[PDB]
Amino acid sequence: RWDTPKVVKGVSFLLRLTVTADDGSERLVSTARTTETTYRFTQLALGNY
Amino acid sequence: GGMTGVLFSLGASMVLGGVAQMLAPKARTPRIQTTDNGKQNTYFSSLDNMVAQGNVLPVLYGEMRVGSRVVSQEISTADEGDGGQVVVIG
């Protein structure tokens, strides 16, 4: 969850999730463009992201 | 110069366009578009928000709910506050 910054006309929120790999690289897990301020993720595995 | 020949009377030369035209000056219909489909808008109605860039400010004469010309549109975070001290968020 977050807040809405200064805005002209209208905005959407684009959020992406990346997972740190074992070697040190990154793996992207899904992406979402929404309008609501609050978002929820379910059924996440592994460790840090 | 004493006489004025060629009187050149004008009768039907001005009737030829129509008779009500010489009593009333008629009205100007708008231009018809295609992407507009069949909504025949006139020159004294506007039910949508317009853009006020280098344009003229419209005038209103009576009744007849109208749109506007948007000058500033902005979205911020709605802070919590009323006209008092009651600020419960429970």
Swiss-Prot record, chain A:
Assembly description: Interacts with host LamB.
Classification of source organism: Viruses, Duplodnaviria, Heunggongvirae, Uroviricota, Caudoviricetes
Function: Attaches the virion to the host receptor LamB, inducing viral DNA ejection. During tail assembly, initiates distal tail tip assembly by interacting with gpI, gpL and gpK. During virus entry to host cell, binds strongly to host LamB in an irreversible attachment. The binding induces structural changes in the tail leading to viral DNA injection through LamB trimeric pore.
Organism: Escherichia phage lambda (Bacteriophage lambda)
Family per record: Belongs to the Caudoviricetes tip attachment protein J family.
Name recorded for this polypeptide: Tip attachment protein J
Segment of the intact protein contained: 640 to 688 of 1132
Subcellular location field: Virion; Host cytoplasm
UniProtKB/Swiss-Prot annotation, chain B:
Name listed for the protein in its UniProt record: Tail tip assembly protein I
Role according to the record: Plays a role in distal tail tip complex assembly. The tail tip complex is assembled successively with three tail tip proteins J, one tail tip protein I, one tail tip protein L and one tail tip protein K. The tail tip complex interacts with tail measure protein to initiate tail tube assembly. The formation of the tail tip complex is completed by the addition of tail tip protein M, which is followed by tail tube polymerization. May be excluded form tail tip during maturation and would be absent from virions.
Locations listed in the record: Host cytoplasm
Family (UniProt): Belongs to the lambda-like tail tip protein I family.
Lineage of the species this protein comes from: Viruses, Duplodnaviria, Heunggongvirae, Uroviricota, Caudoviricetes
Organism expressing this protein natively: Escherichia phage lambda (Bacteriophage lambda)
